[PDB]
Structures are given as structure tokens and as C-alpha cells.
Amino acid sequence: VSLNQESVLRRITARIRQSLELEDIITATTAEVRALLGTDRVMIYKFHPDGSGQVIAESIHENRLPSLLGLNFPADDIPPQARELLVKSKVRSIVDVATGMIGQSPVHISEDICYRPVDSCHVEYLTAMGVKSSVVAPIFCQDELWGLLVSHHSENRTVSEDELEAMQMIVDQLAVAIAQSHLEHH
Amino acid sequence: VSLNQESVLRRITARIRQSLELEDIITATTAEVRALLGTDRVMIYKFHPDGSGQVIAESIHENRLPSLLGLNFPADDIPPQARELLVKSKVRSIVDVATGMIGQSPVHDLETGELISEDICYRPVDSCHVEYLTAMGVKSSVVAPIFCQDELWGLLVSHHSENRTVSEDELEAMQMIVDQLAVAIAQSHLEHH
Amino acid sequence: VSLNQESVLRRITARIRQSLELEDIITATTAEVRALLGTDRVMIYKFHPDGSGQVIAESIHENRLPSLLGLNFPADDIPPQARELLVKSKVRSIVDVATGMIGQSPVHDEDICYRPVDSCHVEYLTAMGVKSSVVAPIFCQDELWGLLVSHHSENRTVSEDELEAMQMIVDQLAVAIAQSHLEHHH
Ligand SMILES: *[C@H](C)[C@H]1/C(=C/C2=NC(=C\c3[nH]c(C[C@H]4NC(=O)C(C=C)=C4C)c(C)c3CCC(=O)O)/C(CCC(=O)O)=C2C)NC(=O)[C@@H]1C
Ligand SMILES: *[C@H](C)[C@H]1/C(=C/C2=NC(=C\c3[nH]c(C[C@H]4NC(=O)C(C=C)=C4C)c(C)c3CCC(=O)O)/C(CCC(=O)O)=C2C)NC(=O)[C@@H]1C
Ligand SMILES: *[C@H](C)[C@H]1/C(=C/C2=NC(=C\c3[nH]c(C[C@H]4NC(=O)C(C=C)=C4C)c(C)c3CCC(=O)O)/C(CCC(=O)O)=C2C)NC(=O)[C@@H]1C
């Protein structure tokens, strides 16, 4: 009756089984992730080869944040240090604007969230978008960084380990969808 | 603080040995605890079966904050996530209003797995709880749960009107105090079967 | 092309080979350390027997912070709890004024854990015009000898790499002090 991570994954798995078009899998899954997390805006961001990227799916609750679907953002928005954490540690990151802190959890039992001061450039970036809470988990295809699952909220909120676990399961299942689609299409 | 925490424990034990009514043991103890911690308001909060609760003992320094003795608070003040941390991890919590952070230290932690004693880890605290404390004029809150056998029985609550830092040693003191109260409570239950 | 920790240590080692007076090694070193770390003010603080201390060397970028060279500070500026962390854990400390947090990293034999910093210390730093402080202890054999202090007038983030550089520098200074004691032995 209520949405859980298990039922969201079961539907992604069925979509893969039916060989639905990958872009449609990504679009439909993004909407369920937003419903599951309850946040104002959930996006899937896909990297280009030069490290810039594009918002390729987006689900927004009640027009509470602007639509970024289709927009491109430069490589420099994610500096080398942050990018390295994504690639090598598969870090999940929670930004809390009100406290000026970022909480990071590698995948590598190292799944206790450790909070530290976040760079003011990134705080200012989020504030300009009207975002008070950001949660990001990277998406891989095989061993390569493919994109990001991004959750934005217009108000302060707390983020639990269970929520990061749900996001991690979802990006792991999307990785399977992406790899299977590549295999099916040559 | 350590020569003092030991004396607080001894004084509780003396009351148990003299066969004081549990309510009197609890009342007399909060004043000695406040003196030890030095904070403006120390309370013992007792849970009702429905998860609401009541302030059943209180000691305040120089009327610095209003008295909450006898007041009831609804279950909703402690939502399920928070309550589960209390029940399953026996978490001790330090709220620092100025930074908007809450520090939590389990005594023993993870679900149906090995439970391990930790260091204090700080994270952003929910704005509702910050607003709740700020409405009372509280800048620092420290809470340790009281158990009777496996049941969450109550809380030892320490409020202060000014910013402060809280050390491991202070949490350790609070932990010994709630462990000693738990003994008084268990003995009383056995005597009133 | 740029300064790294390895070349900074090689020059400290060369100064040791010249049997320069310890104060002169330390004076000659602080400027390169500031250029390496990039902060507004780097100081070496030497403890007196009663726990008070003196700024015995200092390098400042473009007068961005006042000069504290030669000034003495009382023992109580560093309370027993803080002093014990220095002595027993060789703790490195990062204070972030904007968030009101202090991050501490032991040397041990884990990462940086942030907690609220005492408001007395916040006020101490603010009164100096400091928004970022990073401190690592200096030892001689097993005795706490002084501090390497890095101050900045603007908020910033501090990485593990910066702590590693500071740790290499205070370890090399410990060698300079020990060698100096042996060479000046009666
Ligand atoms: C300053 C002049 C730079 C800049 C600096 C930084 N960005 C940092 C982290 C970061 N940025 C993103 C952007 C990504 N998040 C979004 O919401 C969107 C747009 C929809 C994008 C493209 C991400 C994912 C990250 C990683 C952290 C996170 O997951 O939130 C960063 C590190 C901050 C820290 O860890 O302390 C810095 C210094 N960003 C700018 O835009 C300008 C060019
Ligand atoms: C929001 C609309 C809710 C609400 C939400 C939360 N309360 C949280 C934690 C919490 N609350 C108490 C209350 C307890 N402390 C006191 O001082 C008193 C009264 C004297 C009482 C009854 C406690 C003990 C706790 C646990 C945290 C702690 O030990 O301080 C909470 C979680 C915060 C977090 O951990 O991030 C939330 C979201 N509280 C409300 O009053 C309204 C109805
Ligand atoms: C309050 C009435 C006291 C007082 C209290 C505290 N000082 C704390 C830590 C601390 N202080 C220093 C001083 C040292 N840093 C400098 O920049 C200089 C001078 C240029 C000096 C002499 C250090 C090194 C430390 C350790 C932490 C750090 O490395 O930054 C402290 C603990 C803070 C905390 O950990 O929460 C307290 C409570 N300081 C005062 O000046 C007055 C007398």
C-alpha cells in the first residue's frame, strides 16, 4: 500500500526484463524515487565525456522548484577533489545549508555519515537554486562514473542512513539497467 | 566531576538501602545531579504507556528557567525515528542550538548485529526540535534514557540557557547515574510485585 | 614548479646540516611553510615550562593579519582538556568559525571528526581576525615543545592532505630540535 524501496526496485527489474527504452526506464524511475523520498525535486544527471553533464530526467513536486530538465552544467561545477570522491569512494553526499555542513558516506561498513564544513562556493550554488537540502549518489555503468541521482529540497531536512541505503539500491539497480541496455543494443 | 559522580551514585545507593519510596529517591536525586552537572535545569521524565510522558522530578538553579514539574508532553514530541534510537541503541544526545547540530553516542548500537560503544558523532538536528528548545530558552540539551530491564522507562534531561560544550566524561557521568536509577527502579518493582 | 612538502623538508634538512642555531632554522622555515599552505599567517609557538608560550617565528601574506611575533600568551589559553589531546593523541585541530565547529584528527598508530567548538575559543580567534585555524603540535622526543599554527582571515575548507603536510613539517622540526640539543650538549 505504501511505497518502499523494494517495490521500486521490483518495477525497475520488470522494466529491464521487458527491454523498455533506457531513457523511459530512467524517466519513470526518477518519478518513483521522488515519491519515495518525498522531496521537491529529484533528477538524474548524465555525464558527458568532458565531465560536463545534462539533466536527463526530473520529477518535481507541485512546481516547488524550477525545472532544470534538458539543461547542461559545466565540468567545473564539480571540482577534481569532489569528482575523485565519486569515482574512487562512490561517496554519497548530504548538504545541509542551514548548518553549512556536508555529510559524506563512502561505500567502499564505512557507512556512518561524517559531517564537515562544506565549501562556501557550493553553498552559494545551492542557495541560488533555492535548495536548502541536497543528497547525491553516483550512478556507474560497470566501473565507470555514468551520472548522478540528485535529490533537492526547498526546506531544511534531515537525511537518515535508511534514505541513503534506498538511494544506493536504486543507483545499483539503474547500473544494471544501463549495462543491460548497452549489451542488448550491440 | 569524577570524585563527584561517585558521590552521587553513593547517595542514590544510600536511599535505596534506607528503603525510601522510589518517588522520593528520584526527587532527591535530581538536585544532586544538577549540582554535579552545573546546568540550569535537570529533569527526570517518565513515559506513559502510550509514549507520552510527564516531568516527575526537577531541579533548577536560581529560578533561571520556568518549572516544568508535573507537566505532560505528548508522544509526538519524540517521533518514531528518535524513539527507536532511544530503545534500540540507548542513544545519549547532545543538542547544540548555536551550531544546529546534535551529537549522538550509542552505548550499544546496531540492529540484530554486534552492538558497540562509540564516540560522539554530530549531525544536523531537525529544525522542529531546535525550535522546540529555543521556545523554552534552552541553548544546550543533554538527554540519556533510563531503562527498567528492557523497557524504556524515562529520560534524564539536562537543559541550559547558555551555549556549552559537552565532553565524553559528562556523558559517562550521566550514564552511570541512569544505570544507578535503573537499579532503584528495578528493586522497587520487585518489592511491589 | 610549485612548492611541495618534500622540497620544504629537504631545505630544513640542509639547515640542520649547517648547524644553524635552532631559532634561525625555525625563522628560515616559517616563510616556506606559509607559502606551501597558502594561508595568511603561519607561526611557530614555543612553550615555556609553566605552559605559557611565545610566538618565536611568523610569516604573513601581505599584512592580511597582524603580527604576533615575540608576544607571550598565558597557559590558560589552552585548557587541560585541550592540552591533554595534544600531548596524548598528538591531535591536529581545524577550527571553522563560520560553522562554529572544530575538527580533530589524532595521529594514533580514521578521519576528521567535527564537533561544536567552545565559544571562548571562537571568540579568541575572532578577536584576532581569524576565521580559519589549523594547529599541529611540535615535540622533542616525547615532550610537547610547541605548535605549528596556521591562521586565515577568510573561511576555508581543510583537507587531509594539508594535515599530512603539517604533520611532515612538525616531524622534521622535531628532528631539528633533537639534533640541536645533541650538538649543543656540554
Ligand atoms: C566554486 C567557484 C565552483 C564550485 C565549487 C564546488 N562544487 C562542489 C561539489 C559539488 N557540486 C555539484 C554540482 C552538481 N550538484 C547539483 O545539484 C547540480 C545541478 C543540478 C550539479 C551539476 C556536486 C554533485 C558536488 C559534490 C558534492 C555534493 O554531492 O553535493 C565542491 C565541493 C564542496 C565540498 O565538498 O565541500 C566545490 C568546492 N561549484 C560551482 O558551481 C563553482 C564553479
Ligand atoms: C515537530 C513538528 C515535532 C517534533 C519533532 C522532533 N523531536 C525530536 C527529538 C526529541 N524531542 C524530545 C522531547 C523531550 N526533550 C525535552 O526537553 C522535553 C520537554 C521537557 C521532551 C518531551 C527528545 C528527548 C528528543 C530526542 C533528541 C534529544 O535527545 O534531544 C526530533 C529529532 C531531532 C533529531 O534527532 O534530529 C524531531 C524531528 N518535536 C515537537 O515538539 C513537534 C511536535
Ligand atoms: C576561555 C575563558 C579561555 C580559553 C578557552 C579554550 N581554548 C581552547 C583551545 C585552544 N586554544 C589555543 C591557543 C593557541 N591558538 C592560537 O592561535 C594561539 C595564539 C596565537 C594560541 C596560544 C589552542 C592551540 C587550542 C586548541 C584547539 C586548537 O588547536 O584550535 C579551548 C577548547 C576549544 C575546543 O576544543 O572546543 C577552550 C575551552 N581560551 C582563552 O583564551 C580563554 C582564557
Q: Is A156 on the interface with C (CB under 8 A)?
A: no
Map out the domains of chain A with their CATH numbers. 1-186 (3.30.450.40)
**Enclosing H/E stretch for A87:** helix A80-89
CA of B168 to the centre of ligand 2 (A): 22
DSSP string for B85-124: HHHHH--EEEEETTTTEEEEE-SS-STTS-------EEEE
CA distances from C105 to A103, C34, C174 (A): 17, 21, 19
Query: Nearest residue on chain B to A160, judged by CA atoms?
Result: B81
DSSP string for C82-128: HHHHHHHH--EEEEETTTTEEEEE-------EEEEPPHHHHHHHHHT
CA B52 to chain centre: 15
Query: Nearest residue on chain A to B81, judged by CA atoms?
Result: A160
Q: In what order do the strands lie in the sheet with B53-60?
A: B72-73, B53-60, B41-47, B151-160, B140-148, B92-96, B101-105, B121-124
Closest residue by Cα to atom 10, ligand 1, is: A78
CA distances from A71 to A27, A68, A83, C100 (A): 15, 6, 20, 36
Amino acid letter for position B36: L
Rg (CA), chain A: 16
Structure-block grid coordinates of residue C55: 610566538
Asked if B187 and B19 touch (Cβ cutoff 8 Å), the reply is: no
β-bridge pairing A53-60 and A72-73 = antiparallel
Asked if B83 and B51 touch (Cβ cutoff 8 Å), the reply is: yes
Structure-block grid coordinates of residue C176: 631539528
Amino acid letter for position A78: I
Q: For residue A19, which phi and psi values (nearest 5 degrees)?
A: 55, 40
Angstrom distance (rounded) from CA C20 to CA A152? 58
Q: Which C-chain residues 86-105 have CB contacts (< 8 A) with chain B?
A: 99-101
DSSP β-bridge partners for residue B54: B46, B72
Amino acid letter for position B60: I
β-bridge pairing C113-116 and C101-105 = antiparallel
Closest-CA residue to C140 (of C163, C173, C167): C173
Per DSSP, which regions of chain B are E strands?
41-47, 53-60, 72-73, 92-96, 101-105, 121-124, 140-148, 151-160
Q: How was this structure determined?
A: X-ray
Half-sphere exposure of A79 (CA within 13 A, CB side): 4
Angstrom distance (rounded) from CA C96 to CA A84? 24
DSSP β-bridge partners for residue A103: A94, A115
Declared resolution, Å? 1.8
Asked if C159 and C105 touch (Cβ cutoff 8 Å), the reply is: no
Mutational test site, ligand 2, from B91, B122, B128, max ligand atoms within 8 Å of CB: B128
Structure-block grid coordinates of residue C94: 581545524
Asked if A105 and A114 touch (Cβ cutoff 8 Å), the reply is: yes
User: A114 CA to chain B: closest CA distance, Å?
Assistant: 8
With a 6 Å cutoff on the Cβ, whether C73 touches ligand 3 is yes
Q: What share of chain A is helix, strand, coil (3-state, %, to 5)?
A: 40, 25, 35
CA distances from A23 to A185, B61, C73 (A): 13, 64, 65
